[PDB]
Structures are given as structure tokens and as C-alpha cells.
Design a protein around this ligand. Structure first.
Ligand SMILES: OC[C@H]1O[C@@H](O)[C@H](O)[C@@H](O)[C@@H]1O
Ligand SMILES: OC[C@H]1O[C@@H](O)[C@H](O)[C@@H](O)[C@@H]1O
Ligand code: NA
Lengths: 346, 339
């Protein structure tokens, strides 16, 4: 079933319930996921109104772009030309600059296919917005089906050669309480290499490093605490994880990642080449989620996209988008029960 | 009473009914007025859903900006520097460029003061948006009161020196039907001068012309048919009226214009120096409003703002907005019924 109501400030909340009784909800404020519950338990982090997002933290569950991550000194080269984008994190352009797409009300239309329901959100980034050539007509379709798959499909077309590499900023927390660290979750990730950050400014270092057999190796499932407890320079630098992981095998067909807690798992599929993982390394900030003070490590993202730093490490890919060419990306989060045996204690 | 409902595409329709039973409704799509009615009759033009505005005509009742009107060659000088804005009508930048603020979903908050209810719409125009320096934080507050006063108050702040001169694009039609020309309405307007257009491109001609004692003198109430049947080359040029009129006496207290049809009249007040009047000179277009095919002259606007063309005729004013300065503007449309 589909339900809709005002969510505040003019945004709406679209709630869907599939045949298995699983519920998922979105808001057109930032074409974002607000909640996902199973048997009354939240699987992700989210707020109860639109104003909370705007006042506490506007990234959670959002669609972010046009370019996800940091761009050193806001400088991109588009078709032989240098373009400087909005710099909102020091000289860096983080998640498309200030007051980006995640802060706007997108128009939307809902399509009921029965076993699947689609919520297609649209927005136009005008030419020159935040320094990006355009205009860019974008659309994010979020869908949920009877098989517990939440899918994100991105599409875009630009009038001019530009850059495009958006992502979904959901944070999971299988504990269903922000005040509980995810160190107790099991993580499996099909990636043998990662991208180190230069320093606290978080721009990329310049090299690609192999992590096999290190505390960042999750090819074979392990508790997140292993990473959190690590004293590897990169973990210390960021106080947890906040890096891109390069997938070893590409393709929407492979389970790239799996996050488990007891009897629940979330599997990650995508057609993108990397997964940027950030573990809510907020220290004692304690942002309130549903009246619970969030803890350091109280959440984890799986932002599938082309890795950040390709400006410096060409090997990571190319995010340019040619005028008239159609951008498309697909990411999927599927929910499962009793997929494996995960019985631990922390 | 206040009622909020879905207007389509995720937009909302906010309807306010005052003590007199008069209803006015707005939508966050473009911080715009959708309807205004009394005793079941519409006073203004509007559609029945969001999609209509997007498909038929996105301007009606909307907040247009950041600059209202046409800018020659899309060119403006900011701090002695030339900037080229988005060109969406030939080489001109019309009403802020393509996909401007009138096609965006603004956030809003309703504030009920009893005798008055206010609806504050907000939107951030990112720096660089359509060539404009920013970011510009804008807000448009539409309010309605028990005295039948509909008021528009604009406010903006920019991080960088930029340009700013928005307007409300409501079209009135006291006939309450688009298929009926407003030629029967009577218009009074406190302006002795106007700004002629160069030609069919509608850019300014370059001069300011005295209208005293011409078909365009409305200093004394007159029927619109008069202007409409005029042979003045300017009327003939656009097939009606599509020009900036310079107000004689500036200030919010003075009734600047008055539109009348029978016992129903609309008074316009503003703190702006000019009023741009366009008489829906669409010819055979036939856009449909409420299932009624619009006729040529089936509407009229009162766009209060600084006259377009100041890039060429500096006497007109100056639309710049320096970093950190707070822009404010107020326009009021007041409804009266003779007894
Ligand atoms: O919370 C916003 C951001 O926090 C930063 O510290 C992370 O590096 C970003 O990747 C994330 O988008
Ligand atoms: O910009 C709003 C209106 O302005 C007039 O100058 C034009 O002639 C109209 O076609 C247009 O819809
Ligand atoms: Na809505």
C-alpha cells in the first residue's frame, strides 16, 4: 500500500508497505530515504520531520551530488577547460557544494506496479549552479518490491559537457538505535584495495593501496570492531572508516557487500566501481535520532559511486558527462533474514 | 480557515478563507497565487493542478525572478564586470532565464495571526545559478486578511554583489472567465510616462515617453477598450499593452492603480517605482483555463517592480544588490465591492 502526508516545510512523506509487511519511507526533500523498518525496528537512521534534517544534519539518506565526495580545491577539468566549483569545505567542494541537491524539494510521481512501487523524483540543476555546467535534468527513482529490494536508479542529461557522480547517503544501523555502535555488526566486502587520504582535510593521498590481511580486509566476514580497534594510520586519521573501497569485480549481479546483525542482513549491489564507507565518526557530537543520542560509530554508509580523487588518480575513473549523453547508475540494497549464522557478543 | 492539500507533483495548495468568506489559494510551486474568488467567481486566472502550469504556462501568478522582464543580450554589469545570464528568449534573458524560480518547489511555513494569515515561501538560488552571482537567500511572504487585502512581501540576501528585481505575475480577469476580454474593465493608473519598446523583440527602445493625453493616459479612469482600439504605434506593435509605466508618486500609501468591473474593484499599492502591464495579447493561442479557451486580451497583469531596461536607461533605476544588503519589497492588491 502507499500512503502520503505532509512531512513539514512543504515536503511530503511517501510510505510504502510491501506484501511481506516491510515498510519503507521517502521524502522529496533531497529525494531521500527516511526510514526502513522490519517488525517495528529501524534498519537505518532518520529523523521524524523535515525540519530535523535541515537543522541537525541534512545528509542522512539523501541523494547527494552532483558529485559525491570531495574535489580538491573545487577544481575540475571539463573538456580541456578548468572550472572551479562551489567550495564549502575549506577550498574543497564537498557533496556538490553548499545548499546542494540534498537540500531541495524535488517534484515526484508515484508508479504502482503491484509487486513493485516506484517513486520518481525530478530536479533540474540550472546551468552554472554551484559552478557546474548544465543545465542538468536529473531524476532519481526509488523503488521497493515484494522481495524486499530497495532500488535506486539515477538518470541524467546535460545541455553541456559537465561532471556527474551522485550517490545515496543512507546510514544503516541494524541495532535500530543510534546510541548503539555498529561495531557489533558483521561486514563482508569484495574489495582488496582502498584509497588513503592525505590528511585531515580528507583529500586523497595519491596512491592506491592493497589491504589484504590488514584490519581493513573484509573479503571474508568480520566484526566491524576489528576496524574500529585498529591503530593503522588511516583509521586513526579519521577515527574509524571514511574511505573509498575499490570493488574487485564489477557488475550489478555480484553481492558487493553484506552487512549482518544476528538474523538480519543487508546486501549491496551496484553497477558502480567503488563503495565509500563512512562510520559516523562523530565523537561525542551526539545528534539526536528519535530522541537517542547518536554514538561515535553509530551508523555506516555504503555510498556506491565512482571513487572520489579521480581528478588526481585518473585510474579511479572519469566522471565527465558529455552533452546529450545519458547518465545512469543503479544501486540496490536488499534485505534478508537468516541468511547466515551470526551470533556474537560485544 | 486554512486548508492544505496536494496540488500535484508533490506541490501543495494552501487555501485561505477570511472572515468575509473570500478565498485565496497559493502553491509552493513557484510561490504563486492560484486562485482568488468571491461568491464563486474567480478574480484572477489560474489552473487546476501543478502539471497544468508546467505544461501550459508557468508564469501565471508566479513569483518571477531574480530579475523580472527582459535583459538585452542577457547582459548585466556587476562591479564594472560583465556577466552573461541564461538566454531563453533569443539573446534575451527573460524572467530570470530558463527553468527559473517560478518552476521550483519552494519550502513554506504558514503563520496564522487570526485576522491575517501569512504563508512564507523560501528558496536559495545557488551562486552561479543561470549566471547570477549568489547564493541568494530569498523569501516571499503572501498574506491575506480579513480586510480582503492580499499582500506580497519580498526579502533577499546575497553572499555576493548581484542583481535582483523580482515581481508577482498574477493576471486578473474580473469577468471570471478567460474566454472574456478585459476590454470591459475600467482602469485607473497614476502614471504619466511609459517606456516604449524597440520592436517585436520587446527590448526597450531607449527613451522615456510622456503619455499625457494619449490613449495610454489612465490618470483618469477609462475603459480598456480605448487603449485596445488605439492606433498608437506602440499599441499596434504588441497588439495591446506590454509596457512599463512610470509611477508619478512613489510610496506604499498611495493607490497606484485601480481595476474595476461593475461593483468589483482591485486597488494596487506598492513601494516599487513601476508597474509593468501586459494584457494577455496571445491572439489565437487559446490556452485553457478551467476548460475555457483564453481569448486575446483575456487577462491583465500589474507587475510592480523596477522597470526593465535600466541596463540601457539608467534613469529607470538600479537593480543591483550588494553583498550583505537586505532587499525588501512590498506589493498589495486590495479587493472592494461597492454597496
Ligand atoms: O556528514 C557529512 C560527511 O562527513 C564527512 O566527515 C565525511 O567524510 C563525508 O564523506 C560525509 O558526507
Ligand atoms: O514575461 C511575462 C510576459 O511578459 C511579456 O512581456 C511577454 O510579452 C509575455 O509573452 C510573457 O508571458
Ligand atoms: Na506536497
Amino acid at each position: 500500500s502507499i500512503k502520503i502526508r505532509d512531512f513539514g516545510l512543504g515536503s511530503d512523506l511517501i510510505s510504502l508497505t510491501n506484501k511481506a509487511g516491510v515498510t519503507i519511507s521517502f521524502t522529496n526533500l533531497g529525494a531521500r530515504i527516511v526510514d526502513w523498518q522490519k517488525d517495528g525496528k529501524h534498519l537505518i537512521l532518520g529523523f521524524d520531520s523535515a525540519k530535523e534534517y535541515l537543522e541537525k544534519d541534512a545528509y542522512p539518506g539523501a541523494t547527494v551530488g552532483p558529485t559525491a565526495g570531495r574535489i580538491k580545491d573545487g577544481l575540475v577539468k571539463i573538456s580541456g577547460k578548468d572550472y572551479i566549483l562551489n567550495q564549502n569545505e575549506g577550498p574543497q567542494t564537498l557533496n556538490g557544494g553548499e545548499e546542494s541537491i540534498h537540500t531541495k524539494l524535488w517534484t515526484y510521481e508515484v508508479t504502482d506496479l503491484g509487486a513493485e512501487v516506484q517513486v520518481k523524483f525530478s530536479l533540474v540543476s540550472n546551468d552554472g549552479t554551484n559552478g557546474y555546467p548544465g543545465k542538468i535534468e536529473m531524476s532519481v527513482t526509488h523503488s521497493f518490491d515484494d522481495d524486499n529490494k530497495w532500488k535506486i536508479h539515477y538518470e541524467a542529461i546535460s545541455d553541456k559537457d559537465t561532471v556527474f557522480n551522485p550517490t545515496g547517503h543512507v546510514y544503516f544501523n541494524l541495532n535500530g538505535d543510534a546510541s548503539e555502535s555498529v561495531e557489533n555488526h558483521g561486514l563482508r566486502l569484495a574489495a582488496s584495495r582502498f584509497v588513503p587520504l592525505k590528511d585531515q582535510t580528507e583529500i586523497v593521498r595519491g596512491d592506491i593501496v592493497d589491504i589484504k590481511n590488514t584490519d581493513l580486509d573484509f573479503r571474508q566476514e568480520k566484526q566491524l570492531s576489528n576496524a574500529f580497534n585498529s591503530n593503522m594510520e588511516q583509521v586513526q586519521l579519521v577515527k574509524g572508516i571514511d574511505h573509498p573501497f575499490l570493488l574487485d569485480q564489477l557488475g550489478l549481479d555480484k553481492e558487493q557487500a553484506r552487512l549482518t546483525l544476528d538474523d538480519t542482513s543487508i546486501s549491496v549491489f551496484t553497477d558502480q566501481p567503488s563503495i565509500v564507507i563512512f562510520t559516523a565518526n562523530f565523537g561525542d557530537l551526539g545528534t539526536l535520532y528519535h530522541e537517542k543520542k547518536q554514538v561515535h560509530h553509530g551508523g555506516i554508509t555504503f555510498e556506491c559511486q565512482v571513487s572520489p580523487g579521480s581528478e588526481q588518480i585518473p585510474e579511479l575513473g572519469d566522471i565527465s558527462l558529455k552533452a546529450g549523453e545519458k547518465y545512469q547508475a543503479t544501486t540496490i540494497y536488499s534485505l534478508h533474514t537468516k541468511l547466515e549464522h551470526h551470533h556474537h557478543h560485544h
